[PDB]
Design an enzyme around this catalytic site. Structure first.
Site, mmCIF file in Angstrom:
data_model
loop_
_atom_site.group_PDB
_atom_site.id
_atom_site.type_symbol
_atom_site.label_atom_id
_atom_site.label_comp_id
_atom_site.label_asym_id
_atom_site.label_seq_id
_atom_site.Cartn_x
_atom_site.Cartn_y
_atom_site.Cartn_z
ATOM 1 N N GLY A 94 5.589 0.308 3.439
ATOM 2 C CA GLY A 94 6.161 0.525 4.746
ATOM 3 C C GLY A 94 5.265 1.445 5.529
ATOM 4 N N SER A 95 5.843 2.053 6.560
ATOM 5 C CA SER A 95 5.112 2.869 7.525
ATOM 6 C C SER A 95 4.420 4.148 7.048
ATOM 7 C CB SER A 95 5.997 3.122 8.734
ATOM 8 O OG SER A 95 6.329 1.867 9.300
ATOM 9 N N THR A 96 4.653 4.566 5.811
ATOM 10 C CA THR A 96 3.858 5.663 5.242
ATOM 11 C C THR A 96 2.386 5.205 5.220
ATOM 12 O OG1 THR A 96 4.383 4.771 3.046
ATOM 13 C CG2 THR A 96 5.667 6.690 3.772
ATOM 14 N N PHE A 97 2.199 3.885 5.169
ATOM 15 C CA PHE A 97 0.856 3.263 5.125
ATOM 16 C C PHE A 97 0.140 3.346 6.471
ATOM 17 C CE2 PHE A 97 -2.071 -0.441 4.246
ATOM 18 C CZ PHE A 97 -2.547 -0.041 3.010
ATOM 19 N N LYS A 98 0.901 3.565 7.549
ATOM 20 C CA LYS A 98 0.328 3.689 8.887
ATOM 21 C C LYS A 98 -0.730 4.782 8.985
ATOM 22 C CE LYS A 98 3.768 1.990 12.265
ATOM 23 N NZ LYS A 98 5.030 1.651 11.561
#
Ligand SMILES: [Cl-]
Ligand SMILES: [Cl-]
Lengths: 505, 506
Positions: free
Chosen positions: B230-234
């Site tokens: 998810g967005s932790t990967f952003k």
């Protein structure tokens, strides 16, 4: 979507392990699901639902309602009793038209034979989050990297399911009669080293996981034993080759005093002066101790080393035990001549014994026939007959076989219970003391023995070698001392010879 | 008798696993033991013996009595319930003075903390025939050949885990299970400057002492299980965008949605915010920003960027069967969804490794959990763990710009991650609210809020002492609050207690 895990097959292409599609029961309970619906999309009548589902799955009505009453939950499941459901269970449940009930497909590892060569095949476990299967014991573990997928590679074993059945049924019988602490049987092709059957008790069921983890150790490769008098055959072989054993020469039986210990023939008093051939038929400890003296202690240690003892056989099973030759002092040396002190694996025993039927060449036992991919047809590994060493000459092997024939067939035999009506059998018995696991000494009790038999048939030119061992009968210990493993050897050997089309008389 | 198996220790020398002496119950039932005895030495009253023994071994009297009634038996044992008995159980049974009853000494593996860092420490199983212990999972398995004294005492394994911090993690996870009953759950605490794993746990798990639930989930979440993060990967796409010159915090970009290869991909709030600054877009965890940055940087470069951050490959830790995950880059849809942590799969250890670059001048630290392997008798040290750089994907300057945005995520006026703030401490990090792939069949898991919620945080901000990463997959209870609060009810107590324990100023 995981790749399909490869299959484990027997030598005839029968499936021992494969992936299958089963089903998981799911029940929607939150009212919101039926907000914009013509008919209800959640469980409206929990009691009637639990009543009908109770016929399919193995759960009582009250426990189903209890789970259906979970607050703040949109959807609920029913544990392992609600998963691994067959396609028939799916249709059965779907015909009921229960609002909010559905079945989701899920992949499981299937062992068609259930409890069957369990400690050899092993078990693969599933990670619920991803569906990923990983081997946790046996072939499933050893070959996990090949088996895992594309599509995984198949592993073909040397096991013959027909013979495996005879072994499973015979061990089941020994458990009921003797309730032993440990038990094993293995059938090996005498001329190739292939393992045709292998089982142990206690064991587990790879399909259900029942008892998985109670005993990690595979008896054939990982567990060790003080073998007892089956080990006398290797001392006999050495003595024959060294010119110390003459079947007609007389020797003094009875007992020997060594380092404070009184080691005597099984009957206490012995038989006075008797021929060495007869001494071997009687399984005389004094004969072996004397033969050890005639050959020499240093040379005997090397003899046991050349028979593969104290070293792993280098099979493909993980963590193979090397055992150890007990030779620290004269008491260990002398007791080693009859299979105490020294420890061995059953696979070492099979390897050593094979020398007598292959012109003195030991055959490396093997159980993996092939590792291959069924899509590409690539063969990563192919098993084969391999010589592990040639410790004795053909002449020596023939002379050892003559004595093994006598053990069972002499008019003065003490192993007549191993005879099979209509077949010629030969071999050697063992009745060993067992080391207490928490040190000290040997296990105490009325008949605290590891009883075993290393047999082959047809005698002289055998088709198979059958090795069976039973440690510490907790029931009928007297009969176990008297009959050893004859009640397992006879049915295993007789059924196997028939299946292999050996002529009866 | 087997050699003593080595111990497993935490970073301060507290015992996590060791061999101990326990007792096995044995009952003599044969008359022969009392042939020449004034008092009986075998069980004469089976009903009473069964009643009295049922008070110590967790077995019904009718079952004990049945076992005592076995024909053609000399001695009776009682299965697993009659083994692993304590010295206290022993005295209690001996004081009963039951004819024929005795206790045999035996060696068992003992885990003093019970269910504690279970999936990391593992469990050793005992072969009853010889007493030989063998590791079946985790450290017990990985280091089995060192730990066992037969491959004469075995070698000890010292971990980087701190039992005090581990307690904080075990309590927080117990709380999340009670509140959300998730399908999967993990938390890890890492030293932000060394890469040492100070605490690690997951749910569901097992009890190494009793073996309860052992086998239900073989996979260690940190090293073996994979997730669409998810967005932790952003944060890694942002870092790449910053170093390439594509991210200008002041520059405006048009938000809302983007139609990629047929599918409509939009920001979490559906409508977006129209034309807004990039810096603000990252604070809002905008999917359109990341997709736009991917275009500015270019698809080929971004794949390479994710590769330099260590994704798609094992970190090469000492855990067995470490998963490599994979970068989803087969078509534009996979490429674009990877910008916000879907399609691409990772392990939590990869996430920790990548994140460490922002606090170590661009250098990724290889996470480690084994401090040493050494024999306590000879004093030979077979292995000694240490800090090691896994790669330097970014510059000191780029790492600082990223940290500036992580700060805003939690501390900006327009923040949607305020629930992660801790009174008295300056925290920063990135939130994740990912869809989860269905095990069988295609597509994502369905439901009202079928998400993998997570947070990658650190404190104190800019100069953190530790990094805490927690994730919860598919809450089966309070799924609504799981979506709204993520893993805040785990992060806060874990981080706050850890900072206090490490003596960080408040
Ligand atoms: Cl093999
Ligand atoms: Cl490590």
């Amino acid at each position: 979507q995981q790749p399909e895990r490869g299959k484990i097959y027997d030598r005839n292409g029968k499936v021992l392990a494969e992936d299958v599609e089963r089903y998981k029961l799911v029940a929607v309970i939150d009212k919101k699901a039926s907000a914009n619906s013509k008919k209800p999309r959640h469980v409206v009548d929990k009691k009637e639902t639990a009543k009908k589902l109770s016929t399919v799955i193995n759960m009582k009505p009250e426990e189903i309602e209890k789970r259906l009453s979970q607050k703040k939950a949109f959807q609920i499941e029913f544990g392992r009793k609600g998963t691994n459901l067959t396609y028939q269970d799916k249709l059965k449940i779907e015909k009921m038209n229960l609002p909010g009930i559905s079945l989701l497909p899920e992949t499981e590892r299937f062992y068609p034979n259930g409890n069957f060569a369990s400690h050899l095949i092993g078990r693969a476990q599933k990670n619920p989050d991803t569906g990923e299967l990983k081997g946790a014991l046996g072939v499933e573990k050893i070959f996990d990297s090949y088996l895992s997928g594309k599509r995984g590679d198949d592993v073909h074993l040397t096991i013959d399911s027909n013979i495996q059945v005879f072994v499973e049924e015979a061990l089941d019988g020994m458990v009921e009669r003797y309730q032993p602490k440990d038990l094993f049987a293995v059938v090996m092709d005498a001329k190739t080293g292939e393992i045709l059957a292998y089982s142990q008790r206690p064991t587990f069921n790879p399909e259900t996981g029942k008892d998985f983890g109670k005993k990690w150790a595979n008896d054939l490769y990982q567990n060790t034993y003080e073998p007892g008098s089956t080990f006398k055959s290797y001392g006999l072989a050495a003595a024959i080759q060294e010119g110390a054993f003459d079947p007609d020469k007389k020797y003094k039986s009875g007992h020997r005093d060594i380092m404070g210990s009184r080691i005597s023939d099984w009957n206490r008093v012995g038989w006075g002066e008797i021929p060495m051939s007869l001494g071997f038929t009687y399984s005389s400890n004094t004969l072996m101790m004397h033969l050890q003296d005639l050959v020499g202690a240093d040379k005997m240690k090397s003899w046991y080393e050349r028979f593969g003892f104290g070293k792993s056989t280098k099979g493909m099973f993980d963590g193979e035990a090397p055992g150890q030759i007990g030779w620290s002092n004269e008491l260990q040396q002398k007791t080693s001549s009859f299979g105490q002190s020294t420890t061995v694996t059953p696979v070492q025993m099979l390897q050593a014994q094979s020398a007598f039927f292959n012109d003195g060449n030991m055959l490396k036992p093997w159980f993996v026939n092939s590792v291959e991919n069924p899509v590409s047809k690539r063969q990563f590994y192919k098993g084969q007959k391999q010589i592990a060493g040639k410790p004795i000459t053909k002449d020596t092997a023939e002379k050892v076989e003559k004595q093994l024939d006598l053990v069972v067939n002499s008019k003065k035999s003490h192993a007549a219970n191993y005879r099979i009506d209509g077949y010629e059998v030969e071999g050697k018995t063992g009745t060993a003391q067992v080391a207490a696991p928490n040190g000290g000494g040997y296990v105490k009790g009325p008949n605290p023995y590891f009883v075993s038999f290393m047999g082959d048939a047809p005698k002289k030119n055998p088709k198979v070698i059958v090795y069976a061992g039973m440690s510490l009968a907790q029931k009928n210990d007297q009969e176990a001392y008297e009959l050893g493993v004859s009640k397992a050897f006879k049915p295993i050997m007789e059924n196997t010879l028939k299946y292999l089309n050996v002529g009866k008389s």
